[PDB]
């Protein structure tokens, strides 16, 4: 139950998000432009990965906020 749903939902999401290249036929110039583009894409992904990490930390902080609001409530 839900064993395949989770795994293949995740794989489906990563399939629509990522783009597949028919690398074998790619020409000389094409390897140039594309490896530049792929490196830039990885650059941006790491950029807002770091943003996600930071904002993960702050959302942890607001969890801290709300859980303390709860414990004081007794």
């Amino acid at each position: 139950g839900k064993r395949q749903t989770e795994r293949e939902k995740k794989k489906k999401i990563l399939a629509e998000r990522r783009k597949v290249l028919a690398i074998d036929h790619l020409n000389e110039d094409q390897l140039r432009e594309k490896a530049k583009e792929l490196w830039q894409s990885i650059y941006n992904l790491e950029a807002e990965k770091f943003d996600l990490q930071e904002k993960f930390k702050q959302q942890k902080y607001e969890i801290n906020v709300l859980r303390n609001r709860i414990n004081d409530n007794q």
Partner: protein
């Protein structure tokens, strides 16, 4: 005094400009330019609020401390800043929660007194006793030993 400039800082420019140009609804000609205290209630009806005898008489008491029977423009600005409490057109809260994160420098969930003392001395003013004492009375209600985000928001309401 510092209340006059604090009232200047805590009120936006458009509000005070409309307030003064609209106080100029009572003056008509060959007058001192400062209307009697009771007429002040009437300009308030223009403002859209409907105050009551208790607040009206109290507020009346909040003007003309030296007892001249008349109101000047600086007392006018301080009383207006002291009337509607919707300062800063609604103080924000999200960035403020970021600032709550700022008060805390050990990542615990609340504001320590030592963190408050360093925060206050970082301005340039040292520690005096009435400072922290009154700041604690303003911020806290039951001696919980800390300033949480509700007391945080409450203490600085309207402040920019």
């Amino acid at each position: 005094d510092d209340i006059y400039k604090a009232a200047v800082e805590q009120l936006t420019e458009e509000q005070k400009n409309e307030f003064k140009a609209a106080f100029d609804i009572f003056v008509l000609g060959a007058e001192d330019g400062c209307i009697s205290t009771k007429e002040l209630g009437k300009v308030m009806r223009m403002l859209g609020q409907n105050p009551t005898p208790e607040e009206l008489q109290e507020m009346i008491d909040e003007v003309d401390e030296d007892g001249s029977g008349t109101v000047d423009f600086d007392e006018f600005l301080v009383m207006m800043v002291r009337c509607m409490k919707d300062d800063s057109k609604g103080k924000s809260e999200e960035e403020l929660s970021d600032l709550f994160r700022m008060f805390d420098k050990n990542a615990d969930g609340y504001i320590d007194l030592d963190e408050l003392k360093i925060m206050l001395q970082a301005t340039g003013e040292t520690i005096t006793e009435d400072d922290i004492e009154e700041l604690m009375k303003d911020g806290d209600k039951n001696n919980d030993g800390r300033i949480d985000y509700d007391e945080f928001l409450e203490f600085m309401k309207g402040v920019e």
